[PDB]
Amino acid sequence: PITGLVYDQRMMLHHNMWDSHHPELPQRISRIFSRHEELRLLSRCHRIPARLATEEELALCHSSKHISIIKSSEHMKPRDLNRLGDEYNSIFISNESYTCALLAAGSCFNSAQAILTGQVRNAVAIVRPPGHHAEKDTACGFCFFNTAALTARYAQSITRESLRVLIVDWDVHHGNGTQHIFEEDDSVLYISLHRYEDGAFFPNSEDANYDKVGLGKGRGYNVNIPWNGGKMGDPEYMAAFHHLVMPIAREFAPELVLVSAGFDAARGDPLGGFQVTPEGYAHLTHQLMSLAAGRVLIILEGGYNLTSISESMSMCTSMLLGDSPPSLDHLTPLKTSATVSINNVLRAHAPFWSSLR
Ligand SMILES: [K+]
Ligand SMILES: [K+]
Ligand SMILES: [Zn+2]
């Protein structure tokens, strides 16, 4: 079994010209790549080339209006770039941003193609800018185009329209964009674990609560696991996987798993406030590898402590390469509100998934 890896230093060119210390840094991807070199993981992977996504591929999930506006930013002067960025919720834009977003998406398409053709068993995509907050018609939360959503549709386009794709989103923030893109769809199961705080945590919407289960034929196919009032870590995430993620995933029987792999729930993150360890992320990855005959693509989303994300994503790659899971620290009893969250999701999803009964 071969593991794929995609990384292209051109994705570093997207930058914040007014605030060069903004946490969505160019060096997020070079640091993760460097740590893979350090641990001698890079030579163990098959290197998959990056490419630009096409406008036609972007149209799988995004409106032409949205594509056109972001495309136009490539030739704007700094004042217009500042003005445009400020129209969105939490976005900065440079002349290279559009191209970088295209590269992120096209990198993941090549990776999914490699997985689905059998060239690799699984893969990791060290990409930026991130995707999961991007909506059909707007940019949001450092995201321009919804890389993971686009990848699911790209995968369906080269196999069959009803290919069952599981998206597990373990970034500490709710993937608002991914939820909305697939909300009426039963071919793409969306499972998000996120810090919620009764709607007080970015992106600040009650769309992230456990009662949002999908619409129309997508009823039951949107699973939100919202955390409230607690510094959640390995015990809570392992419990969520045991009680919710894995039973639902096995019943869905995905043919491809995409991980919206933010590392901002990691111990040390400046924004997330959580304490998931690298060993934690390794165990989550290892569990997901039991699905879809091991066809797993890990896509970088958020995560802002450069040391933490580097160690955490490298450990995921180590798992995809078939290395033995590292030992977790003794798992303490769950924070009381985490039990409450898990039970709430169980109640909301019991009608749709017989494995939860
Ligand atoms: K999430
Ligand atoms: K869905
Ligand atoms: Zn995030």
Coordinates of C-alpha atoms and ligand atoms in Angstrom, one line a residue:
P1 CA 0.0 0.0 0.0
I2 CA 1.3 3.5 -1.1
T3 CA 0.4 6.8 0.7
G4 CA 0.2 9.9 -1.5
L5 CA 1.4 13.4 -0.5
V6 CA 0.7 16.7 -2.2
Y7 CA 2.5 19.9 -1.3
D8 CA 3.4 22.9 -3.5
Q9 CA 5.3 25.9 -2.1
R10 CA 3.4 28.2 -4.5
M11 CA 0.5 28.0 -2.0
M12 CA 2.7 30.1 0.4
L13 CA 2.2 33.2 -1.9
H14 CA -1.3 34.0 -0.5
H15 CA -0.5 36.5 2.3
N16 CA -1.9 39.3 4.5
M17 CA -0.1 42.5 3.4
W18 CA -1.5 44.7 6.2
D19 CA -1.0 42.1 9.0
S20 CA 1.9 39.9 8.2
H21 CA 1.5 38.2 11.7
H22 CA -2.1 37.1 10.9
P23 CA -2.3 33.4 12.1
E24 CA -3.2 31.9 8.7
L25 CA 0.5 32.1 7.7
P26 CA 2.3 31.0 4.5
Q27 CA 4.6 29.0 6.7
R28 CA 1.7 26.8 8.0
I29 CA 2.2 24.5 5.0
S30 CA 6.1 24.7 4.7
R31 CA 6.3 23.8 8.5
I32 CA 4.1 20.7 8.1
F33 CA 6.1 19.7 5.0
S34 CA 9.4 20.3 6.8
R35 CA 8.3 18.1 9.8
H36 CA 7.5 15.3 7.3
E37 CA 11.1 15.6 6.0
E38 CA 12.5 15.6 9.6
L39 CA 10.7 12.5 10.6
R40 CA 11.6 10.8 7.3
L41 CA 7.9 10.5 6.2
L42 CA 8.2 12.4 3.0
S43 CA 10.5 9.8 1.3
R44 CA 8.0 7.0 2.3
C45 CA 5.1 8.8 0.3
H46 CA 4.4 9.0 -3.4
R47 CA 4.5 12.7 -4.3
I48 CA 1.3 13.8 -6.1
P49 CA 1.7 16.9 -8.3
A50 CA -0.4 20.0 -7.5
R51 CA -2.5 21.6 -10.3
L52 CA -4.8 24.5 -10.8
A53 CA -8.5 23.7 -10.5
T54 CA -10.5 24.9 -13.6
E55 CA -13.4 27.3 -13.5
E56 CA -15.6 24.5 -14.6
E57 CA -14.5 22.4 -11.6
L58 CA -15.1 25.4 -9.2
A59 CA -18.7 25.5 -10.6
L60 CA -19.4 22.0 -9.1
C61 CA -20.0 23.9 -5.8
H62 CA -19.8 27.7 -6.4
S63 CA -21.8 30.3 -8.2
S64 CA -20.3 32.1 -11.3
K65 CA -20.7 35.4 -9.4
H66 CA -18.5 34.2 -6.6
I67 CA -15.9 32.6 -8.9
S68 CA -15.8 35.8 -11.0
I69 CA -15.2 38.2 -8.0
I70 CA -12.4 36.1 -6.5
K71 CA -10.9 35.6 -10.0
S72 CA -10.8 39.5 -10.5
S73 CA -8.7 39.9 -7.3
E74 CA -5.7 38.7 -9.2
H75 CA -5.1 42.1 -10.8
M76 CA -6.4 44.5 -8.0
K77 CA -4.3 47.1 -6.4
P78 CA -3.8 47.0 -2.5
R79 CA -6.6 49.4 -1.7
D80 CA -9.2 47.4 -3.7
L81 CA -7.9 44.2 -2.2
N82 CA -8.3 45.6 1.3
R83 CA -11.8 46.9 0.4
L84 CA -12.9 43.5 -1.1
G85 CA -11.5 41.5 1.7
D86 CA -13.4 43.6 4.3
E87 CA -16.8 42.8 2.6
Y88 CA -16.4 39.2 3.9
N89 CA -16.4 37.8 7.3
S90 CA -12.7 37.2 8.2
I91 CA -10.9 37.3 4.9
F92 CA -7.7 38.8 3.6
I93 CA -6.7 38.8 -0.1
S94 CA -3.6 39.4 -2.1
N95 CA -2.9 39.1 -5.9
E96 CA -1.8 35.5 -5.4
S97 CA -4.9 34.3 -3.4
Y98 CA -7.0 33.2 -6.3
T99 CA -4.2 31.0 -7.8
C100 CA -3.4 29.6 -4.3
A101 CA -7.1 28.6 -3.8
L102 CA -7.1 27.0 -7.2
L103 CA -3.9 25.1 -6.4
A104 CA -5.4 23.9 -3.1
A105 CA -8.4 22.5 -4.8
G106 CA -6.6 21.0 -7.8
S107 CA -4.1 19.3 -5.4
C108 CA -7.0 17.6 -3.7
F109 CA -8.6 16.5 -7.0
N110 CA -5.3 14.9 -8.2
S111 CA -5.1 13.2 -4.8
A112 CA -8.7 11.9 -4.9
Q113 CA -8.1 10.7 -8.5
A114 CA -4.9 8.8 -7.3
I115 CA -7.0 7.2 -4.5
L116 CA -10.0 6.2 -6.7
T117 CA -7.8 4.8 -9.5
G118 CA -5.8 2.7 -7.0
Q119 CA -2.5 4.4 -7.6
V120 CA -2.3 5.1 -3.9
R121 CA -4.4 3.6 -1.0
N122 CA -4.7 7.0 0.8
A123 CA -3.2 10.5 0.8
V124 CA -2.5 13.7 2.6
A125 CA -2.9 17.2 1.2
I126 CA -0.8 20.0 2.7
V127 CA -2.7 22.9 1.3
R128 CA -3.8 26.5 1.9
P129 CA -5.8 28.6 2.0
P130 CA -8.4 26.4 3.8
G131 CA -11.9 25.6 2.5
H132 CA -14.6 24.5 4.9
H133 CA -16.1 27.9 5.7
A134 CA -16.5 28.8 1.9
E135 CA -20.1 28.9 0.8
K136 CA -21.5 28.4 -2.7
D137 CA -21.8 32.2 -3.1
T138 CA -19.3 33.7 -0.6
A139 CA -15.8 33.5 1.0
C140 CA -15.6 33.3 4.8
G141 CA -13.2 32.5 7.6
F142 CA -9.9 32.5 5.6
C143 CA -11.6 30.3 2.9
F144 CA -12.3 31.2 -0.7
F145 CA -13.5 27.9 -2.3
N146 CA -14.6 24.8 -0.5
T147 CA -11.8 22.4 -1.2
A148 CA -13.3 19.4 0.5
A149 CA -16.8 19.9 -1.0
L150 CA -15.3 20.4 -4.4
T151 CA -13.3 17.2 -4.0
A152 CA -16.4 15.1 -3.1
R153 CA -18.1 16.4 -6.3
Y154 CA -14.9 15.9 -8.4
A155 CA -14.7 12.3 -7.1
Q156 CA -18.4 11.7 -8.1
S157 CA -17.6 13.2 -11.5
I158 CA -14.9 10.6 -12.3
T159 CA -16.7 7.6 -10.8
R160 CA -20.5 7.8 -10.6
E161 CA -22.8 10.6 -9.4
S162 CA -24.0 8.6 -6.3
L163 CA -20.5 7.6 -5.0
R164 CA -20.9 7.7 -1.2
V165 CA -18.5 10.2 0.2
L166 CA -18.0 10.7 4.0
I167 CA -16.6 14.1 5.0
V168 CA -15.4 14.1 8.6
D169 CA -14.5 17.6 9.7
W170 CA -12.4 17.7 12.9
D171 CA -11.3 21.3 12.6
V172 CA -12.4 23.0 15.8
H173 CA -14.7 25.3 13.8
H174 CA -18.0 24.2 12.2
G175 CA -17.7 23.8 8.5
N176 CA -20.7 26.0 7.7
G177 CA -20.0 25.9 4.0
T178 CA -19.7 22.2 3.7
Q179 CA -22.9 21.7 5.6
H180 CA -24.8 24.1 3.4
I181 CA -23.4 22.7 0.1
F182 CA -24.5 19.1 0.9
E183 CA -27.5 19.9 3.2
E184 CA -30.1 18.3 0.8
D185 CA -27.8 15.5 -0.4
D186 CA -27.7 11.9 0.7
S187 CA -24.6 11.0 -1.4
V188 CA -22.3 13.0 0.9
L189 CA -22.5 12.4 4.7
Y190 CA -21.1 15.4 6.6
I191 CA -20.0 14.8 10.2
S192 CA -18.5 17.8 12.1
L193 CA -17.1 17.9 15.6
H194 CA -16.7 21.5 16.7
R195 CA -16.5 24.0 19.6
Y196 CA -20.0 25.6 19.7
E197 CA -20.5 27.3 23.0
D198 CA -24.3 27.7 22.3
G199 CA -23.5 29.6 19.1
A200 CA -20.9 32.0 20.6
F201 CA -17.8 30.4 18.9
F202 CA -16.8 31.3 15.3
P203 CA -18.6 31.1 12.8
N204 CA -21.3 32.1 15.4
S205 CA -24.3 30.4 13.9
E206 CA -26.9 28.0 15.4
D207 CA -26.6 26.1 12.0
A208 CA -23.8 24.2 13.9
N209 CA -26.1 22.8 16.6
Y210 CA -27.0 19.0 16.9
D211 CA -30.6 19.5 15.8
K212 CA -29.5 20.4 12.2
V213 CA -29.8 16.9 10.6
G214 CA -30.1 17.8 6.9
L215 CA -33.0 18.7 4.6
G216 CA -35.1 16.8 2.1
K217 CA -33.5 13.6 0.9
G218 CA -30.4 14.8 3.0
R219 CA -32.4 14.2 6.3
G220 CA -30.1 12.2 8.6
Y221 CA -27.0 12.9 6.5
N222 CA -25.7 16.0 8.4
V223 CA -24.2 15.2 11.8
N224 CA -23.2 18.1 14.0
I225 CA -21.3 17.2 17.3
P226 CA -21.2 20.5 19.2
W227 CA -19.0 21.0 22.3
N228 CA -20.1 23.4 25.0
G229 CA -18.4 24.6 28.3
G230 CA -15.2 22.5 28.4
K231 CA -11.6 22.2 27.3
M232 CA -12.2 19.2 25.2
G233 CA -9.4 16.8 24.4
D234 CA -8.6 13.2 23.5
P235 CA -11.2 11.5 25.9
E236 CA -14.1 13.5 24.4
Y237 CA -13.0 13.0 20.8
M238 CA -12.4 9.3 21.3
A239 CA -15.9 8.9 22.9
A240 CA -17.5 10.9 20.0
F241 CA -15.8 8.6 17.5
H242 CA -16.9 5.4 19.5
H243 CA -20.5 6.4 20.1
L244 CA -21.3 8.5 17.0
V245 CA -18.8 8.9 14.1
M246 CA -17.8 5.3 13.6
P247 CA -21.2 3.6 13.9
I248 CA -22.9 6.2 11.6
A249 CA -19.9 5.9 9.1
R250 CA -20.0 2.1 9.0
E251 CA -23.8 2.1 8.3
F252 CA -23.4 4.7 5.6
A253 CA -20.6 2.5 4.1
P254 CA -18.6 5.3 2.3
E255 CA -16.6 4.6 -0.9
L256 CA -14.3 7.5 -0.1
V257 CA -13.5 9.4 3.1
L258 CA -12.3 13.0 3.1
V259 CA -11.1 14.5 6.3
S260 CA -11.4 18.3 6.7
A261 CA -8.4 18.1 9.0
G262 CA -8.0 21.3 10.9
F263 CA -5.5 21.1 13.7
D264 CA -6.9 24.0 15.7
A265 CA -8.4 21.7 18.4
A266 CA -4.8 20.8 19.2
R267 CA -3.1 21.5 22.5
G268 CA -1.3 24.8 22.0
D269 CA -3.6 26.4 19.4
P270 CA -3.9 30.1 19.9
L271 CA -7.6 30.2 18.9
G272 CA -9.2 26.8 19.6
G273 CA -8.8 26.5 23.3
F274 CA -8.8 22.7 23.2
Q275 CA -6.2 20.0 24.0
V276 CA -6.4 17.2 21.4
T277 CA -2.9 15.7 21.3
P278 CA -0.9 14.4 18.2
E279 CA -1.5 10.9 19.5
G280 CA -5.2 11.8 19.6
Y281 CA -5.2 12.7 15.9
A282 CA -3.3 9.5 15.1
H283 CA -6.0 7.5 16.8
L284 CA -8.8 9.3 14.9
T285 CA -7.0 8.8 11.6
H286 CA -6.4 5.1 12.4
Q287 CA -10.1 4.6 13.1
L288 CA -11.1 6.3 9.8
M289 CA -8.7 3.9 7.9
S290 CA -11.1 1.0 8.7
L291 CA -13.7 2.7 6.4
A292 CA -14.0 2.6 2.6
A293 CA -11.3 0.0 2.1
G294 CA -8.8 2.5 3.5
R295 CA -9.6 5.2 0.8
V296 CA -8.9 8.2 3.0
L297 CA -7.7 11.7 1.9
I298 CA -6.6 14.1 4.7
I299 CA -7.0 17.7 3.7
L300 CA -5.5 20.5 5.8
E301 CA -8.0 23.1 7.0
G302 CA -7.2 25.3 10.0
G303 CA -4.7 25.0 12.9
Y304 CA -2.4 27.9 13.9
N305 CA 0.3 26.7 16.3
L306 CA 3.0 25.8 13.8
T307 CA 4.7 23.2 16.1
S308 CA 1.3 21.7 17.0
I309 CA 0.0 21.4 13.4
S310 CA 3.3 20.1 12.2
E311 CA 3.5 17.3 14.8
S312 CA -0.3 16.5 14.5
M313 CA -0.5 16.3 10.7
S314 CA 2.8 14.3 10.5
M315 CA 1.3 11.8 13.0
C316 CA -1.8 11.4 10.7
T317 CA 0.5 10.6 7.8
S318 CA 2.4 8.1 9.9
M319 CA -0.9 6.3 10.5
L320 CA -1.8 6.4 6.7
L321 CA 1.7 4.8 6.1
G322 CA 0.7 1.9 8.3
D323 CA 2.7 2.7 11.4
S324 CA 1.4 1.5 14.8
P325 CA -0.8 4.0 16.7
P326 CA 1.1 5.8 19.5
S327 CA -0.3 5.2 23.0
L328 CA -2.8 7.7 24.3
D329 CA -2.4 9.2 27.8
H330 CA -4.8 7.6 30.4
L331 CA -8.2 8.7 29.3
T332 CA -9.9 10.6 32.2
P333 CA -13.7 10.6 32.6
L334 CA -15.5 12.9 30.1
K335 CA -16.2 16.5 30.9
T336 CA -19.9 16.4 31.9
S337 CA -21.1 18.7 29.0
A338 CA -19.4 16.3 26.5
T339 CA -21.6 13.5 27.7
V340 CA -24.6 15.8 27.3
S341 CA -23.5 16.8 23.7
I342 CA -23.0 13.1 22.7
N343 CA -26.5 12.1 24.1
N344 CA -28.1 15.1 22.3
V345 CA -26.6 13.9 19.0
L346 CA -27.7 10.3 19.7
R347 CA -31.3 11.5 20.2
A348 CA -31.3 13.6 17.1
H349 CA -29.8 10.9 14.9
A350 CA -31.4 7.7 16.3
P351 CA -34.4 8.1 13.9
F352 CA -32.1 7.8 10.9
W353 CA -29.3 5.4 11.9
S354 CA -30.2 2.0 13.4
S355 CA -26.6 1.5 14.7
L356 CA -27.4 4.3 17.3
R357 CA -30.4 2.4 18.7
Ligands
K1 K -15.4 20.8 12.4
K2 K -25.3 16.0 3.9
ZN3 ZN -10.7 26.2 12.3

